[PDB]
Amino acid sequence: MFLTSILLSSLYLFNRILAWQGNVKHFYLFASNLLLLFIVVLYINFNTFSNSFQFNFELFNSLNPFGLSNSDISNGLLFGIDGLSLTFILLTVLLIPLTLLGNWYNINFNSNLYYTLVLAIGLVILLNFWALDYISFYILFEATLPLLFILIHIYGSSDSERASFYVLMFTLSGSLFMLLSIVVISIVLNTTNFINHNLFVLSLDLQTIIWLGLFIAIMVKTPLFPIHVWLPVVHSESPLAGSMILAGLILKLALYAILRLLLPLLCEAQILYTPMIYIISLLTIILTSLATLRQIDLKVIIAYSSISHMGIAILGVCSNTSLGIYGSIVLGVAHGFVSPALFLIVGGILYDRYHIRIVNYYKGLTTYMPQLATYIIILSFANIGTPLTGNFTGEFLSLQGGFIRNPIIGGISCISVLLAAIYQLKLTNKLTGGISSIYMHRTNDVTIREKFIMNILIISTLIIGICPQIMYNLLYWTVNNYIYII
Amino acid sequence: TFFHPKSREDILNEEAKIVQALNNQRELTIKMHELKREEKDYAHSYSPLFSDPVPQGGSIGKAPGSSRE
Amino acid sequence: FALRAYNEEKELALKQRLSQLPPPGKAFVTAEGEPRPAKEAELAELAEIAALYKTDRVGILDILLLGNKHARLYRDNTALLKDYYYNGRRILDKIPVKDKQTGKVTWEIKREGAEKEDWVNQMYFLYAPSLILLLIVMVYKSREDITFWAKKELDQRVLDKHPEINDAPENERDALIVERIIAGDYDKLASLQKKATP
Amino acid sequence: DPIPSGALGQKVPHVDESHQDLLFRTSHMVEDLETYDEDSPINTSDANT
Amino acid sequence: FHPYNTLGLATQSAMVGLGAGVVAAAARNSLATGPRNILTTFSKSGGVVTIFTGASIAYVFTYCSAANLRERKDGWNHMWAGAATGAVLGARTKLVPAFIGWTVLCGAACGLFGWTGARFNADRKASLEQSPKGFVQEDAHQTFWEVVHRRPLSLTVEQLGEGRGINAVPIATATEAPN
Amino acid sequence: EWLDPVKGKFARPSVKFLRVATMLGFAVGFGAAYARSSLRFFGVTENAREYKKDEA
Amino acid sequence: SEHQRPELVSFDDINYNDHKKVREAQESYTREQFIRLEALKTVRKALEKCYEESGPNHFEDCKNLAEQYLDMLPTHRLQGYLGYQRNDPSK
Amino acid sequence: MLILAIISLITFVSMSKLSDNRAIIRLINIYLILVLVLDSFLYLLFLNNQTYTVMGELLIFNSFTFYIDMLIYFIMIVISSLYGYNLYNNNLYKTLFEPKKELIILFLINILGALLIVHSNDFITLFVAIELQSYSIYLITAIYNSSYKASKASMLYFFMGGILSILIAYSINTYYSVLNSYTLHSLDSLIINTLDLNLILIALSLGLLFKIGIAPLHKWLISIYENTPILITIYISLIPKISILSYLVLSNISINSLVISILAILTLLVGSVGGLLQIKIKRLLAFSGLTNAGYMMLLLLLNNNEFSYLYYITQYSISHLAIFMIIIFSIYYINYINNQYNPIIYVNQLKGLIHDNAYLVLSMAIVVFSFIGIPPLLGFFGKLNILMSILNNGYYFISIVLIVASLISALYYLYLLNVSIQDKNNILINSNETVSSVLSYILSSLIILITFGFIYNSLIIDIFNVYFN
Ligand SMILES: CCCCCCCCCCCCCCCCCC(=O)OC[C@H](COP(=O)(O)OCCN)OC(=O)CCCCCCCCCCCCCCCCC
Ligand SMILES: CCCCCCCCCCCCCCCCCC(=O)OC[C@H](COP(=O)(O)OCCN)OC(=O)CCCCCCCCCCCCCCCCC
Numbered sequence A: 001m002f003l004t005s006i007l008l009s010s011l012y013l014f015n016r017i018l019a020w021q022g023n024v025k026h027f028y029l030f031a032s033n034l035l036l037l038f039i040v041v042l043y044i045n046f047n048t049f050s051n052s053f054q055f056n057f058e059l060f061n062s063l064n065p066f067g068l069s070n071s072d073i074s075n076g077l078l079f080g081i082d083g084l085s086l087t088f089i090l091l092t093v094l095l096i097p098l099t100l101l102g103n104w105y106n107i108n109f110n111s112n113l114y115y116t117l118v119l120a121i122g123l124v125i126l127l128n129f130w131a132l133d134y135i136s137f138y139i140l141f142e143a144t145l146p147l148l149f150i151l152i153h154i155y156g157s158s159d160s161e162r163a164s165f166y167v168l169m170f171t172l173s174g175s176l177f178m179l180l181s182i183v184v185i186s187i188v189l190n191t192t193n194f195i196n197h198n199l200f201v202l203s204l205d206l207q208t209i210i211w212l213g214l215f216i217a218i219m220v221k222t223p224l225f226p227i228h229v230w231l232p233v234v235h236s237e238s239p240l241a242g243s244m245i246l247a248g249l250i251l252k253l254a255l256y257a258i259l260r261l262l263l264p265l266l267c268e269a270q271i272l273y274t275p276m277i278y279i280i281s282l283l284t285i286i287l288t289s290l291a292t293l294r295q296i297d298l299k300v301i302i303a304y305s306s307i308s309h310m311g312i313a314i315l316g317v318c319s320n321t322s323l324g325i326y327g328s329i330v331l332g333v334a335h336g337f338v339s340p341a342l343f344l345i346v347g348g349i350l351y352d353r354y355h356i357r358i359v360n361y362y363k364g365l366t367t368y369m370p371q372l373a374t375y376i377i378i379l380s381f382a383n384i385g386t387p388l389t390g391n392f393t394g395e396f397l398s399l400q401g402g403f404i405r406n407p408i409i410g411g412i413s414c415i416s417v418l419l420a421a422i423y424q425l426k427l428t429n430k431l432t433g434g435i436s437s438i439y440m441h442r443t444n445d446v447t448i449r450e451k452f453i454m455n456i457l458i459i460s461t462l463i464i465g466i467c468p469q470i471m472y473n474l475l476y477w478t479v480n481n482y483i484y485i486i
Numbered sequence B: 001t002f003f004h005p006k007s008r009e010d011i012l013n014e015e016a017k018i019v020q021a022l023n024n025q026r027e028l029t030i031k032m033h034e035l036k037r038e039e040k041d042y043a044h045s046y047s048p049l050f051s052d053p054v055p056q057g058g059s060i061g062k063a064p065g066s067s068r069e
Numbered sequence C: 001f002a003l004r005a006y007n008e009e010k011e012l013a014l015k016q017r018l019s020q021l022p023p024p025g026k027a028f029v030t031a032e033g034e035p036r037p038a039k040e041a042e043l044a045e046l047a048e049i050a051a052l053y054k055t056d057r058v059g060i061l062d063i064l065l066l067g068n069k070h071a072r073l074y075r076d077n078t079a080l081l082k083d084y085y086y087n088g089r090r091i092l093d094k095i096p097v098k099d100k101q102t103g104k105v106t107w108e109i110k111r112e113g114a115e116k117e118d119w120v121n122q123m124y125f126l127y128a129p130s131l132i133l134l135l136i137v138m139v140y141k142s143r144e145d146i147t148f149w150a151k152k153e154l155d156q157r158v159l160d161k162h163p164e165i166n167d168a169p170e171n172e173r174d175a176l177i178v179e180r181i182i183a184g185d186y187d188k189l190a191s192l193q194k195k196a197t198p
Numbered sequence D: 001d002p003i004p005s006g007a008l009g010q011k012v013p014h015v016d017e018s019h020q021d022l023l024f025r026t027s028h029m030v031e032d033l034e035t036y037d038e039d040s041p042i043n044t045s046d047a048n049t
Numbered sequence E: 001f002h003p004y005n006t007l008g009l010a011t012q013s014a015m016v017g018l019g020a021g022v023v024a025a026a027a028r029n030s031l032a033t034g035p036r037n038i039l040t041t042f043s044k045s046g047g048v049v050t051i052f053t054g055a056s057i058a059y060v061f062t063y064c065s066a067a068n069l070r071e072r073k074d075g076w077n078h079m080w081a082g083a084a085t086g087a088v089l090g091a092r093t094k095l096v097p098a099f100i101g102w103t104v105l106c107g108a109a110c111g112l113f114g115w116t117g118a119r120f121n122a123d124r125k126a127s128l129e130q131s132p133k134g135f136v137q138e139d140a141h142q143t144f145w146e147v148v149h150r151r152p153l154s155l156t157v158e159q160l161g162e163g164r165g166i167n168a169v170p171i172a173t174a175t176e177a178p179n
Numbered sequence F: 001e002w003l004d005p006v007k008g009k010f011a012r013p014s015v016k017f018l019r020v021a022t023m024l025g026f027a028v029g030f031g032a033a034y035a036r037s038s039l040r041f042f043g044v045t046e047n048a049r050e051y052k053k054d055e056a
Numbered sequence G: 001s002e003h004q005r006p007e008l009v010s011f012d013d014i015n016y017n018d019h020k021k022v023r024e025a026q027e028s029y030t031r032e033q034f035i036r037l038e039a040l041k042t043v044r045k046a047l048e049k050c051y052e053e054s055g056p057n058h059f060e061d062c063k064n065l066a067e068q069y070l071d072m073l074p075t076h077r078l079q080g081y082l083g084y085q086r087n088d089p090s091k
Numbered sequence H: 001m002l003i004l005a006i007i008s009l010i011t012f013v014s015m016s017k018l019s020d021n022r023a024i025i026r027l028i029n030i031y032l033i034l035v036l037v038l039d040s041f042l043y044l045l046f047l048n049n050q051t052y053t054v055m056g057e058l059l060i061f062n063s064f065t066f067y068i069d070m071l072i073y074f075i076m077i078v079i080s081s082l083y084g085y086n087l088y089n090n091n092l093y094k095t096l097f098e099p100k101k102e103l104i105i106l107f108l109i110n111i112l113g114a115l116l117i118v119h120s121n122d123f124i125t126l127f128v129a130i131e132l133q134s135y136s137i138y139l140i141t142a143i144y145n146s147s148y149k150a151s152k153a154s155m156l157y158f159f160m161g162g163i164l165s166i167l168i169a170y171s172i173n174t175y176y177s178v179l180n181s182y183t184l185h186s187l188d189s190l191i192i193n194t195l196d197l198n199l200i201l202i203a204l205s206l207g208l209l210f211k212i213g214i215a216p217l218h219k220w221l222i223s224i225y226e227n228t229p230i231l232i233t234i235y236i237s238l239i240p241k242i243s244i245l246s247y248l249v250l251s252n253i254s255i256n257s258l259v260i261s262i263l264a265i266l267t268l269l270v271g272s273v274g275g276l277l278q279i280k281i282k283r284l285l286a287f288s289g290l291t292n293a294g295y296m297m298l299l300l301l302l303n304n305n306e307f308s309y310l311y312y313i314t315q316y317s318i319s320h321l322a323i324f325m326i327i328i329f330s331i332y333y334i335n336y337i338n339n340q341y342n343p344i345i346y347v348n349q350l351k352g353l354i355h356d357n358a359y360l361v362l363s364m365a366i367v368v369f370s371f372i373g374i375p376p377l378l379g380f381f382g383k384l385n386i387l388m389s390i391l392n393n394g395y396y397f398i399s400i401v402l403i404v405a406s407l408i409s410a411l412y413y414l415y416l417l418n419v420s421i422q423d424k425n426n427i428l429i430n431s432n433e434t435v436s437s438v439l440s441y442i443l444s445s446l447i448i449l450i451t452f453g454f455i456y457n458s459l460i461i462d463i464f465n466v467y468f469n
C-alpha cells in the first residue's frame, strides 16, 4: 500500500463530508476520539522497564525531508516519549474532544474556523511532549500564539483585543529569553537533544546564566509572581476552549519544561538558586490568593486559583526529592481535570444563559439550578484540595518535599490549604446561597452534554485521588533521574 | 497477554543508534566550523590561473633596476 | 444509515417548495411572538417539512461519488429544515410525529424519547470505552511497578547467597528471608561506587 | 461602536473627503499625521489645463 | 584593582558635557521653527546644557566613587551611576514618583550595561569564537566555555557548599560496612 | 496570454513580439551552450570526448 | 513471571560516549536504590509486628529494630544518579 | 543577459507605442525566467568556495554574489509581473496601475548597478556602480511626473544621495592618499593593525549606509517611500538595501566597530519605536525595513556572517514582497480611493478584510508572524541565526536590544492584523470580476515558502557546508 493513498482517502472523505454537510465538528470529534484510542494503544505497547525513549521518529532530515530518516547523520527534529511525556499526552487527548464539545452549540459565526483552531492548538500541544530537542520544543512552544491570538480576537468577549495582545506579548517576551539560553546551549554543546544532554557538564558560571533565561520564560508561562497579570485577563476574555486548553495544558508545559530542560542540565544552578525560586513561588501563592478575595468577575477567580496551584507545584518539583516530582506532576494532572470543569461552569453555562460574569447578579442557583449547585460544590472542594482528589495528593506531596528542602518556606506555604478555601468558598457560598436573584430569570438546568463533561473530569480526579499509585508505572524512573544528591 | 512491548535490548540499541548519529552531526558541525575560518590559498581565494600575486607594472618605460624581491 | 438513498427530483422540488414559505425565524412568531398567529394548514405544512429533517436522504456511497452541484443543493436545502425544525421545537414546544398509519404529521408534546443528539453516537461508543480501556490498562500495568520486582530480586539474591533456606518449610521462608535481609546488605550500590573508595 | 484606534490604543482620524478641503491646508502637523493629500482628485481637478 | 581619580575624571566629564550642551544648543537653534538668532541658543534651549552636564558629572562621579568605596571594578558601579543619572533627569519633571522611577529604571539599564561588560562593542578574545571550547582533553581545569563529561567533587563542594544533600563523599560509601 | 490575457479576451500575440521573442531566446540558448561547453573545458563536467579531441 | 535479572554497570568503567552503557548504569544505580528501599520497608514491617505483638514490652523487644530503622531512613532512600554521573570523587 | 536585455529593449521600445508596454514587460519577465533556469548550473564553478577575479581585478565572483544575483532576478521577475499582468480588467485598475514606457529600462539598469556593486572588487567599480544604481533610482522616483509628491521625493533623494556619494568618494580618495591602492585585497592583519584606517573605512560604511536609511537619517527615505507610488516603493525599498548591505558584508571592513554598534542600536530603537503611532501603511513598512536593516547591520561586525545574512535577506525580501502584494490586492475591497497612485494609505481602510477575502488575511497573518519571528515560519530561523552569530562573537547588550526591538515591533506589525480581523458592516457577498491568475499564484507561492520552507533547512545547510566552505 501507499501511505499517500491512505491519507488521500482521509482527505477525500473530509472533503465530501465538508461539501454535503457544511460542517467539520463531527469529523474532528471522530479524529479526536481516534487519537485517544491510538495513544492508548501506544500505552499498551509501552515498556515501563526502560528509561530510554521509545517510538522515536525523526523529521525533516536532509535526505528524506517529507518522510522519516533512517540515516547515520541526524540533523533534523527529533521525537519520542518517556513515561513523563506519555502522562500529559493522555491528559491532552482526554481533554481535546471535551474542549470541542463544550462549544458544540454556542458558536454560530465562522464555526469551522473555530474548530480548526482548537484542534490545531491541541495537536501542537500534544506534539510538544514528544519533542526530544530544544529547537523542536521551542517551535512548538511558540506555535500556539498566532492561533490563540486569532481565536481570542474573533470569538472573544468584550475586551478580547487587549487579551489577545497580552497573551502574545507576554509569552513572546519570556520565550525570547528562552531562545537566548537555547542558542547559547547550541553554540556551546553544538547539539540539542533530550537524550544525552545531562552528560555534558558545563561550567557553573555558565549554568548561572543559562538558568536565568530559562527561568524568565517559565515565570511568564507558569505564571509566577510578579508576571502573573496576563493570566486573569486572557482567561476572562477568551472563548471556553481557549480557557480550558490554557489552564489544562499550556500551564503544564512550563512544568514539563523545567523537568526536561532545566533539571537534567543546569543541576548545580538549580541547587544554588532554589531559594530564590521558593521566594517567588511563595509570593505567588499568598498574594494571588489574597488578590482573589477581592475580585468581582467569576472567571478571573478561577484563573487566580490556577496560579496558586502551579506555584505549589513549583515548590515540589524544585525541591530535589522524589515525592516532590510525583506530587508536582499529579498536581498538573488533577489541575487539568478540575480547572476546565470550573471554566466550563462559569464560561459555558452561566455566561451562555445570562451573558454576564459579575458575582453581584448571581445568587440562589440552588433553587432552580440544583444540579449545577452540586457540581459547583464538588469541584470547589476538589479545587481547594479535599482528600480523595488529586489536587490534595499533589498538594501534600509537594509540601512534603518543599518542607524537606527548606522547612520554613515549606511550612509557611501550608497556608495555601487555607487561602484556597477562602477565595473559593466565599464564592461558592454566594452562588449556592440565598434567595434567587431578582436580576436573573430562570433557565434550564444543566444539559446532558455538560453533565457528561463534568462527570468525566470528576471521575478522573477521584480515581487518582483514591489510587494515585497507578501513575507510578510511568514515573518511577522520572522521580529519580532528576535528583542531584551525592 | 496483549502487552507486546519492544524488549529492553532493542530499545537501548535504537536509542544508541540515534545518539551516535547525533554525535556524528556534532563532529561534522565542529569540523566545518573549523574548516571555514581556516586560512586558504591565494588561488582558492582570488585567482586560480594567475596565482602569482606579485604585481608587474607598466612597460612603456621599464627601468632596469625597478624589480625587487 | 442507508447506502444509496439519495434522490434528485425530491430535493430540486423541495428547494422552491421551501422558498414559497416565509423565513424560519419569522414563521412561528408572525412578527408578534404568538404561536396561534400562524394558520393551521401553514402549521401542518411546516411540521411535515420539519419531520423530513431526520430522514435518510443520503448514504455513504452517495456522498463519496456524486458531484458538488448536487451536494450543494442538499446542504443549502437541509439547513432550512434544520432551522425550521428547531425554531418550532423551541417556540411551540412541540415536535412533529407522524404516527404509524395516518399519513399526516403534526406538532406534538411527547418528548420522553425519540430525540437524540448528534454527538452521542461518537462519544458514548468511541471515547468513553477508550477511557475505560485506559483505566484497565493503567491498573494492569501497575503490576509492573518496581516495588514488586525489587522485592522479588531481594528474595532471590538472598536465596543465592544462602541456598539452605529452600529446604525449609514453605511458610517459613518469608521470615527467614526477613532475618537474612535485616542481617546484612544485598544491595550493590557501593560496588558501583568504585572510584569513591580511596 | 466603531471609533478608529491605533497600534498603541491612541485616537486615529478617520479619513474621508471631508478634510481635503482648503481649510485644512497651511497647518503644521508632521508628515505622519497630516492627512492633506496634494494629489487627490478633489484638489488636482484643475491641474495644468 | 587600581583606584580611580574622581575629581580629575569629573572635571573632564563636566567640560565634555558642557561642550555637548553647546553643540546641541546650536543644532536646536538651527533646526527650530520660529524667528531666532544667536541669542536664543542658551535662552530658549530646553535645558540641554544642564541635562548633559549634570548627567556626565553625576554618572562619572558616582561610578568612580562607588568603584573606590566598593574597591572593585564591576557592574554594580554602573548601576549606581545610572541611578544618579536617572535622579538628575527625573528631577526636571517636578514629581516624586517619576523621579524615583527615572532613577530605578535608568539604574537597572546601566546596571545591565555593566553586567554585560560596560561596552556596546565586544572583547573579541573573551568571546566564544576566539577562545578554547569543546571537550577538555585530560583532567585540565575547566574554563568557561569548555565542556566536561565528569567534574571533580571537591570543586563542587567549594562552589556550592555542603549540606542540602550535597556532601564531600557519597552516602552509601560513607555508610558502607567496613567489611 | 492564455493565463491572463492583455485585454479581456484571448488573442494570440502579434508576430512582432514573436520575432523578438525568438531572437532573445536564441541568445539565451547560445549563452547557455557557450557555458556548458566552457565548463567541460574547465573540468567541472564530464569531458572525455573533449579531452581526446584537444589531444588530437 | 519471567523475572528479568539485568546486568550491573557503573559509570567509572564506561566511556560516556557509548550511550547504551550509560543507560545501563543509570538503570542499575536506580534499581539498587529501590532494593535498599525494599529492605527498609521490610524492617518497617517487622517493627510494626514487634510492636503489635509486644505492647508495653516493645521498648525492649523492638529496640534494635527501631534503631536500625532510624539509622537506615536517612541513607536508604532515592538520591539519584546524576550526582555521581557528574562528579568524580577521586579529585 | 541583462545587457542584451537593456540593449534590445531600447530599440524595441522606441519602435513600439504606448499600447505594447505591458506585453514588453511580460516578455522580459519570461526572458529573465529563462536565464534563471538555463544558466543556473554555473553554481558548480564555486565548489569549495573557489573565488574568481574578472576583468583584471575589478570584479569578484563567489557563491555569495551568485546567490544574490539569483535573488535579484527572482525579485525582478515578480516586480515585473506586477506591471505586466493587470489584476482586474476594469477601467479603475487600468488608470491605477499602468506602466510607463521607460520604466522597465530603468529597472534593468538598476539591476545592473546593483550587481556591479556586489560583484565589485575595486572601489572604482563601486563608485561607477553606485552612481548607476543611484541615478537610475532618481529617475524611477520621478518618472511619475504627474504627481506632486513624487516630484518632491526625487528632488530630495537626488540631493541627499549626492551628498553621500561625495562622502564615499572622499573616503576612497583618502584610502588612496594613504596607501596608493583602490583594492581592499591589499589589506590584511598586518596592514589593519599597523595603520590608522578606522576613520577612513567607517566613513565608507556610513556613506553607503545612510543611502539605505540607517539612523538618524531615516526620515528622508521614509518620506520618500511614503510619497512615491506603491509599485515603485516595493522596488526602491528593497534592491538598494540588498546591494549595499551585500557589499559591506562581503568586504569585512568593520569587524568590531563601536560607531556601528551605536548606530545599529539606534536603528532598532527608532525603527521599533517611531513606527508605533503611524497610521499610514507605507511609513509603517518603512520603519519595519529600518529595524530589519538594524538586524542586518549587526552582522557587519562578525567576519563569519554569510549564512545568517543570506537566510535573512531572502526571507526579508520574500515577506516584503508578499505584504506589499496583499496590500495591493486589498484595494478592490475598500470603500475610498485616496489617489491614482496610492489608492490605499491608512491602515484603518483594511478594516473588515476578513469578511471580504479571508484567505488574504491568512496570508497576511503568516507574513506578519514571519516578520515578528514566530516559528515555524522562516523569520524565526532567520533571527535565530543572527542571535547565534552575535552571541558567538561577543555582543550581549545588543542581543537584548534585539529581543526588545522584536517585541516592540510586534505592535506595529499586529496593527494590520488586528484591524483586518475586526468586524465590518456592508460586507461583500458576490463579485463577477476576478483577480488575475498569475499574481495570485505568485502571492501563494511566496506564502507557501514562508510557511513550509523550514522543511528544507537541513538541505540548505548541507549545500552551504559544501559550496561556502
Ligand atoms: C564644541 C566643543 C566640543 C567639546 C569636545 C567634546 C564634545 C563631545 C560632544 C558629544 C556629542 C554631542 C552631540 C549632541 C547630539 C546632537 C544634538 C541633538 O539635538 O540631536 C538631536 C537632533 C535635533 O533634535 P532637536 O532639535 O533638539 O528636537 C528634539 C525633539 N525630539 O536631531 C538629530 O537627528 C541628530 C541626532 C544626532 C545623533 C548622533 C548619534 C548618537 C548615537 C545614539 C547613541 C545610542 C547608544 C545608546 C543605546 C542604549 C540602548 C538602551
Ligand atoms: C560628505 C560631505 C562633504 C563634507 C566632508 C567633511 C569632511 C569629512 C570628515 C571625515 C569623514 C566623516 C566621518 C563621519 C563620522 C564617523 C567617523 C568614524 O566613525 O570613525 C571612527 C573610528 C573609530 O571607530 P571604530 O573603528 O568603530 O572602533 C575602534 C576604536 N578604536 O576612527 C576614529 O577613531 C576617529 C578618530 C578620532 C579623532 C577624530 C577627530 C576629531 C578632531 C576634532 C577636534 C575638534 C577640536 C575640539 C572642538 C572644537 C570646537 C570649538
Ligand SMILES: CCCCCCCCCCCC(=O)OC[C@H](COP(=O)(O)OCC[N+](C)(C)C)OC(=O)CCCCCCCCCCC
Pocket (backbone or CB within 6 Å): A366, A367, A368, A370, A371, A373, A374, A377, A378, A381, A432
Ligand atoms: C464523594 C464523591 C461524590 C459523592 C456523590 C455526591 C453527589 C450525589 C448527588 C447529590 C444531589 C443533591 O444533593 O441534591 C442537590 C441539592 C438539592 O437539594 P434537595 O434536597 O434535593 O431539595 C431541592 C430543594 N432546592 C431545589 C431548593 C435545593 O442541591 C443543593 O441544595 C446543594 C447541596 C449539594 C449537596 C451535595 C451532596 C453531598 C456531596 C458532597 C461530596 C463532595
Ligand SMILES: CCCCCCCCCCCC(=O)OC[C@H](COP(=O)(O)OCC[N+](C)(C)C)OC(=O)CCCCCCCCCCC
Pocket (backbone or CB within 6 Å): H040, H041, H043, H063, H067, H070, H071, H074, H307, H310, H311, H314, H315, H449, H453, H456, H460, H463, H464, H467
Ligand atoms: C537561489 C534562488 C533564491 C531565490 C529565492 C527562492 C529560495 C530558493 C532557496 C534555494 C537555495 C539553494 O538551493 O542554495 C543553497 C544556498 C547555497 O547554495 P548555492 O551555491 O547557491 O547553489 C544553489 C543552486 N541552485 C540555484 C541551482 C539551486 O545556501 C543558502 O545559504 C541559501 C539560504 C536560503 C534560505 C531560503 C530558504 C527558502 C526555502 C526554499 C524552498 C524551495
Ligand SMILES: CCCCCCCCCCCCO[C@H]1O[C@H](CO)[C@@H](O[C@H]2O[C@@H](CO)[C@H](O)[C@H](O)[C@@H]2O)[C@H](O)[C@H]1O
Pocket (backbone or CB within 6 Å): A177, A180, A181, A184, A205, A209, A210, A212, A213, E125, E126, E127, E142, E143, E144, E145, H396, H399
Ligand atoms: C539571559 C541569558 C542570555 C543572556 C546573554 C548572555 C549569555 C552569554 C554568557 C556571557 C559570558 C561572559 O563570560 C566572560 O566572562 C568570563 C568570566 O565569567 C570569562 O571567563 C574567563 O574568565 C577568567 C577570569 O577573568 C578565568 O580565567 C576563567 O577561567 C575564564 O577563562 C570569559 O572571558 C568570558 O566568557
